[PDB]
Amino acid sequence: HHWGYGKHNGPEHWHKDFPIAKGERQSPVDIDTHTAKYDPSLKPLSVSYDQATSLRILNNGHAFQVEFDDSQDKAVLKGGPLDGTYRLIQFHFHWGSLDGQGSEHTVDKKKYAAELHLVHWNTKYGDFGKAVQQPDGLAVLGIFLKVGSAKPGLQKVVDVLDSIKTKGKSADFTNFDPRGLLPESLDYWTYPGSLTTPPLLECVTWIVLKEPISVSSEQVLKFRKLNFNGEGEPEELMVDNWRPAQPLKNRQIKASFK
Numbered sequence: 001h002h003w004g005y006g007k008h009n010g011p012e013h014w015h016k017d018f019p020i021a022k023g024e025r026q027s028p029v030d031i032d033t034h035t036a037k038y039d040p041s042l043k044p045l046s047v048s049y050d051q052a053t054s055l056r057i058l059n060n061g062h063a064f065q066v067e068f069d070d071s072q073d074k075a076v077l078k079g080g081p082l083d084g085t086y087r088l089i090q091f092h093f094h095w096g097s098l099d100g101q102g103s104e105h106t107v108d109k110k111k112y113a114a115e116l117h118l119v120h121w122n123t124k125y126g127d128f129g130k131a132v133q134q135p136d137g138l139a140v141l142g143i144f145l146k147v148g149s150a151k152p153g154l155q156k157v158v159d160v161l162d163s164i165k166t167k168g169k170s171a172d173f174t175n176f177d178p179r180g181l182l183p184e185s186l187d188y189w190t191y192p193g194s195l196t197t198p199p200l201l202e203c204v205t206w207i208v209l210k211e212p213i214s215v216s217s218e219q220v221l222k223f224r225k226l227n228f229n230g231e232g233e234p235e236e237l238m239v240d241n242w243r244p245a246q247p248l249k250n251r252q253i254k255a256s257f258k
């Protein structure tokens, strides 16, 4: 009976195995655009993905994860609110059963159809496992998805999903360029928070882009064909794998833009 997104093991149950679920800097949160304060001190966000090297894509029973070779100084996030350099290790999505829900962060209570998370670790801590034990261990770039025009750069991801339908399936996924998943503008909101999946560690600087990307209905429909279950188990569609907004508590959301 491990954690998931169902009635008996979903977000409202997580605190039992992971007490930090009720902690002081949990994610995601609602972004109140009128309360977020422009911070002229923020530096421009630097996203350097030109040398990114993808390895594999995996269905882990909670989402699908595209993993990168992070053994060299390549796909790096820096600047913005960050001190130092963070290296890309993986990205994944959260999405809904319907276009009207799916995102984890919300904007003035608005839910997007999905949300992309590009996860980077602080190189000062040597590797991901050590980084997540530190308050400034991770930087996650969050990008909202809305349904409209197709995102051509997402299609390579969508076409491989048939091969990793069920929990535990993985496939080679080389030469995928995550630059194809970025919106035009890098305007962002930033706040200190957590992983949004167990173990929910409070180790993330969140950087959430204001501009969503558009994906087509057909593209998101293919996300919804994935399965939470493993091969040979009763089919339960992988949908609504999002944690809802958590209390902001003692935190300020800063905006990079006015």
Ligand SMILES: [Zn+2]
Pocket (backbone or CB within 6 Å): 092, 093, 094, 117, 196
């Ligand atoms: Zn995530």
